[PDB]
């Protein structure tokens, strides 16, 4: 069995050597001449109240107007950000909700948590009262995330080291992704839905093919867990955050890390990440109660969205890029412009 | 557009009139997490109070709502799914004294890890020791040998506060009290009065297990209130 270990370590050395060979210049060196974006002093423009406990996740809507948020008091609330009016209220069966999603067709919203179950709700019921449509079961550990591909396909990640894909109509699994030694804490569909990348609790991020139910690559470089992940808008890269208080960017083609964002004063862990529509900015939530805007092409900090009284646990940006949003353990949301 | 705005305002008014009702029930309920090693007799306690990735048990003491969540069907990697409970009244922590490879050291390290956790420097923790009779049997028959796994058990001296139950063998009392102080050597370092530990002794089938947690919840709430007023 040892010969297998020698083969594995030799393959690891080969992959490392190939990555080094493909490494000639750094992203900062290439972008050493671009202009700085300047000080980005945003300011709140709304504030939504009604969540009893800490907001653990929120998702936008495809129209950039509505949004859905989830708290650990057992409640889903769909706010109209323009008028800040509650449209729906849904009492969850499992109070320990840990994620939420908004269907692209704006008709369904899904959530999951410590009960291992993913539940689907219908927004356009004939009677108008929101009720459970289909319950998806089959995981053996808290569900750390979920996303929609269309009105019928939903992709989910769990704390059992496996990502699963589902057919909502029948309720049966269609694929099972495996290969993570640690819990998967997030994922993000590609812009064209071809691929999806998940980061897990071993400092490794794995890229998959949604159809063949197989793995494609594996990115490493972090020193601790990975709590957040998201695709760059063009779909050719992604970035993540880790408990080592650093953010990084990995290019699919390069198969290696391009740059790392860090600062001495920062000694806390990131909890969320997102890009802007143009892809020239990068936000992230810290447990120090401060968000931060990192210049993607310069790695220098360009601002801070201070104003939360407690840990930042989620974040989001509209498709059109008009309004950021953030939740926190203080139980209040804040729209930023 | 005026009619649509009026309809939206009415819908929001109904939603808020429902959320105000909801806010009145979530404030009259206590959230308690029930930890405990696998072989700690944890379930026997739950079976007493009652008489999927999480099991929920609801009860009430003197018309006070309690909410007790039992973990299950989860991997033994705790350092992430544990943060969800940073807002609980108190985390029950059952243990077996007869544990003494030796599960007692594992429980000691786990309790220390909980204590020194940042998201939980404000989440009080209750402590049980649920293998008292087993410890008594193991020490009576000479099979204790606690000195082997602890180089300081024969040089320990019983505290002056001992109030032993009838028929208690001095050696049994000394040992059982020795077990307690090992954990309390941690719960009195870096405490700073923000959160506390409540040592206790209880058999797995003790009826009073509800009363002890009820009283400890009362004390925690009172202390937090008094600390809001700067009276403590």
């Amino acid at each position, epitope marked *: 069995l040892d010969q297998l270990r020698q083969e594995a370590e030799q393959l690891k050395n080969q992959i490392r050597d190939a990555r080094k060979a493909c490494a000639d210049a750094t992203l900062s060196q290439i972008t050493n001449n671009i202009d700085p974006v300047g000080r980005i002093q945003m300011r709140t423009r709304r504030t939504l109240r009604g969540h009893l406990a800490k907001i653990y996740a929120m998702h936008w809507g495809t129209d950039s107007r509505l949004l859905v948020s989830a708290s650990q008091d057992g409640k889903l609330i769909i706010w109209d950000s323009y008028t800040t009016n509650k449209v729906h209220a849904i009492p969850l069966r499992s109070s320990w909700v840990m994620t939420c999603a908004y269907a692209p067709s704006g008709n369904y919203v899904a959530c999951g948590g410590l009960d291992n179950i993913c539940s689907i709700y219908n927004l356009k019921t004939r009677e108008g009262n929101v009720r459970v449509s289909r319950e998806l079961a089959g995981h053996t550990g808290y569900l750390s995330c979920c996303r929609f591909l269309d009105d019928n396909q939903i992709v989910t990640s769990s704390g059992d080291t496996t990502c699963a894909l589902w057919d909502i109509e029948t309720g049966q699994q269609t694929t099972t992704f495996t290969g993570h030694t640690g819990d998967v804490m997030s994922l993000s569909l590609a812009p064209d839905t071809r691929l999806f990348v998940s980061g897990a609790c*071993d400092a490794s991020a794995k890229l998959w093919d949604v159809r063949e139910g197989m793995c494609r690559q594996t990115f490493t470089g972090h020193e*601790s867990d990975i709590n957040a992940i998201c695709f760059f808008p063009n779909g050719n890269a992604f970035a993540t955050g880790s*408990d*080592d208080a650093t953010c990084r960017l990995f290019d699919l083609r390069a198969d290696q890390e391009l740059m790392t964002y860090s600062h001495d004063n920062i000694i806390c862990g990131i909890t969320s990440v997102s890009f802007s529509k143009s892809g020239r900015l990068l936000l992230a939530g810290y447990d120090d109660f401060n968000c931060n805007v990192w210049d993607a092409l310069k790695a220098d900090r360009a601002g801070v969205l201070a104003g939360h009284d407690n840990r930042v646990s989620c974040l989001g940006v509209t498709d059109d890029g008009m309004a950021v949003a953030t939740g926190s353990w203080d139980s209040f949301l804040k729209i930023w412009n | 557009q005026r009619n649509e705005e009026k309809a939206q305002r009415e819908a929001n008014k109904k939603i808020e009139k429902q959320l105000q009702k909801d806010k009145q029930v979530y404030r009259a309920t206590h959230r308690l997490l029930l930890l405990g090693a696998g072989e700690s007799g944890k379930n026997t306690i739950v079976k007493q109070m009652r008489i999927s990735g999480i099991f929920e048990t609801k009860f009430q003491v003197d018309k006070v709502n309690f909410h007790m969540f039992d973990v299950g069907a989860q991997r033994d990697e705790r350092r992430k799914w*544990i943060q969800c409970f940073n807002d609980v009244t108190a985390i029950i922590f059952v243990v077996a004294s007869s544990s003494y*490879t030796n599960r007692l050291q594992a429980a000691l390290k786990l309790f*220390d*890890s909980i204590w020194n956790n*940042k998201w939980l420097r404000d989440t009080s923790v209750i402590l049980f020791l649920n293998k008292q009779d087993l410890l008594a049997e193991k020490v009576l028959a000479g099979k204790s040998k606690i000195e082997d796994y602890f180089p300081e058990f024969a040089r320990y001296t019983t505290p002056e506060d001992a109030t032993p139950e009838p028929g208690e063998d001095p050696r049994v009392t000394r040992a059982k009290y020795f077990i307690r102080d090992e954990f309390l050597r941690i719960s009195t370092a870096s405490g700073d009065g923000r959160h506390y530990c409540y040592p206790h002794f209880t058999c797995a089938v003790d009826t009073e297990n509800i009363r002890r947690v009820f009283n400890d919840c009362r004390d925690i709430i009172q202390r937090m209130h008094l600390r809001q007023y700067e009276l403590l």
Partner: nanobody
Framework: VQLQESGGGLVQPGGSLRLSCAASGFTFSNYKMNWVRQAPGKGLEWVSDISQSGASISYTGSVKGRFTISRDNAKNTLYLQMNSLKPEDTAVYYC?????????????????????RGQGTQVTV
């Protein structure tokens, strides 16, 4: 992240032996350190740990006064010293690390599938 043990072997009862842990891929100083071993027919059990700078140490009771734990942050290596080994010392020794830096707590080190835990080295008595 990499943790490779070395320096094991065979020793008769009451002998001595030194274990050297070589690590790379992370800044050694910021992370606590642990020694953990597993014996046949039994699950993992904890042995010892050392603070970031070594100012704080602690042992399991049954090992107290026998072994010694020391870390050389300048050489990003950890050490364990063996003396007066009893028959029950036969086991593999895993060189471990805490998940998050700058923290006092340390979770999951004795877990069945901890991620940052070396392959271990064998000591037989």
């Amino acid at each position: 992240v990499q943790l490779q043990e070395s320096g094991g072997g065979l020793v008769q009862p009451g002998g001595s032996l030194r274990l050297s842990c070589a690590a790379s891929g992370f800044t050694f100083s910021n992370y606590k350190m642990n020694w953990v071993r597993q014996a046949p027919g039994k699950g993992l059990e904890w042995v010892s740990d050392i603070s970031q700078s070594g100012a704080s140490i602690s042992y399991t009771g049954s090992v107290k006064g026998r072994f010694t734990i020391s870390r050389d942050n300048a050489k990003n290596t950890l050490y364990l010293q063996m003396n007066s080994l009893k028959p029950e010392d036969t086991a593999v020794y895993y060189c471990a690390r805490c998940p998050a830096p700058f923290t006092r707590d340390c979770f999951d080190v004795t877990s069945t599938t901890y991620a940052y835990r070396g392959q271990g080295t064998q000591v037989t008595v």
